[PDB]
Design a protein around this ligand. Sequence first.
Ligand SMILES: Cc1cc2nc3c(=O)[nH]c(=O)nc-3n(C[C@H](O)[C@H](O)[C@H](O)COP(=O)(O)O)c2cc1C
Ligand SMILES: [Ca+2]
Ligand SMILES: [Ca+2]
Length: 146
Amino acid sequence: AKILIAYASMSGNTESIADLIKVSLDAFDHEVVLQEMEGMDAEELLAYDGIILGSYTWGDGELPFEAEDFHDDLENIDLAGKKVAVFGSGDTAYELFCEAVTIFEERLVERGAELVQEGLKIELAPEDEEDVEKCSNFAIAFAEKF
Ligand SMILES: Cc1cc2nc3c(=O)[nH]c(=O)nc-3n(C[C@H](O)[C@H](O)[C@H](O)COP(=O)(O)O)c2cc1C
Ligand SMILES: [Ca+2]
Ligand SMILES: [Ca+2]
């Protein structure tokens, strides 16, 4: 086991970002598991060397209902030594664009994880050239940390 991508997606935008990151991480002969974070016991993260969380942002910059349980679930695990990163899909029409990226970044650092880079912030779906290149650069820099 190596790198885990746990994502929360409702309309598919964050899921599409998770798919792009995994494919890049595949090209480096890493072991990349792709999972949804809902109903996922947070204990599973300790089997991995790297962990990449991903979530969309819901009302008033709050985590979606599905991700707050997993976020609170992280309260009781030591992530010391785990190299982590965060991504998310939001909409700049809101004041708190991709607050979920900041929320999960603080929580992972709050539990001893080594945050290797600033989170990836995509608007809506990664359905154009520079969004795909944003994901491609983010995933490669994470692989350079390994
Ligand atoms: C009711 C509602 C509230 C939202 N609030 C925010 C927000 O506070 N900040 C933000 O960046 N995006 C917000 N969004 C936009 C979603 O984060 C955006 O549509 C995202 O791409 C959905 O990702 P998904 O396809 O993985 O579900 C909101 C969307 C809805 C419908
Ligand atoms: Ca986009
Ligand atoms: Ca663009």
